[PDB]
Structure 1
Amino acid sequence: GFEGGQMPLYRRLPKFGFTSRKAAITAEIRLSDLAKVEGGVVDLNTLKAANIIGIQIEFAKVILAGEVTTPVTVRGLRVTKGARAAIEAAGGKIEE
């Protein structure tokens, strides 16, 4: 980043933001990973055991990426509108 004695670009521009501690422990889940776990019921413990989110994760969302084909029960996870539509279209059930 040195440009001669002239004030470098990474010092001419101002700093912004802050690092969120919640984002380091919040993950997102593709629709394709739902079939990979066993038992048909997804939550934090089963996803960690199946190595999908991470041991330190405390919150997780299911996203409309890929597609699910088998009935699956989502429990205690936030779900997007498109993901919810696909899950219910595939005979699923979402609870809190």
Structure 2
Amino acid sequence: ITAEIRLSDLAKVEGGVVDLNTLKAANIIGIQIEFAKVILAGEVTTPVTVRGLRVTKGARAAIEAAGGKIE
């Protein structure tokens, strides 16, 4: 019941808010997944505020380089 969210498939939800339930409705991760993680898969453009998801050190650099905040 944990997921491994590829950074490329992140700006595909609701502007720039990726809680978990929003990320689930985008069909990125399964329904019975309460913990999730954003890894450095590459390529971000828009600023995405990642609230609730555990974020990787490599992705924290990228997401903030694009403009998006975390928590």
CA RMSD of the aligned region, Å? Answer: 0.9
CA distance in 1, matches of 2:11, 2:62: 14
Instruction: After TM superposition, list the pairs within 5 Å mapping 1:71-86 onto structure 2.
Output: 71-86=47-62
Give the equivalent residue in structure 2 for 1:40.
Answer: 16
Q: Which residue of structure 2 aligns with residue 55 of structure 1?
A: 31
Instruction: Give me the whole-angstrom Cα distance separating, in 2, the residues matched to 1:68 and 1:47.
Output: 16
Identity %: 100
Q: Name stretches of at least 5 consecutive residues in structure 1 with no aligned partner.
A: 1-24
Give me the whole-angstrom Cα distance separating, in 2, the residues matched to 1:93 and 1:39. Answer: 13
Q: Which runs of 4+ in 1 moved over 2 A?
A: none
Q: Distance in 2 between matches of 1:38 and 1:47?
A: 9
User: Which structure would you say has the larger RCO, counting Cα contacts within 8 Å and 6 or more residues apart?
Assistant: 2
Tell me, in whole angstroms, the C-alpha distance in 2 between the residues paired with 1:37 and 1:66: 17
Aligned residues: 71
TM-superposed CA distance for 1:35, in Å, is 1.1
Q: Looking at CA atoms only, which structure, 1 or 2, has the larger radius of gyration?
A: 1
Greater share of strand residues, 1 or 2? 1
SS in 2 for 1:62: strand
How far 1:62 moved relative to its partner?
Answer: 0.2
TM-score for both structures, normalised by structure 2: 0.93
More helix by share: 1
Q: Could you list the per-position Cα deviations for residues 37-86 of structure 1 after superposition, in whole angstroms to 9, with x for gaps in the alignment?
A: 12310011101100001100000000000211110000011101000000
**Whole-Å Cα distance in 1 between the matches of residues 21 and 15 of structure 2?**
12
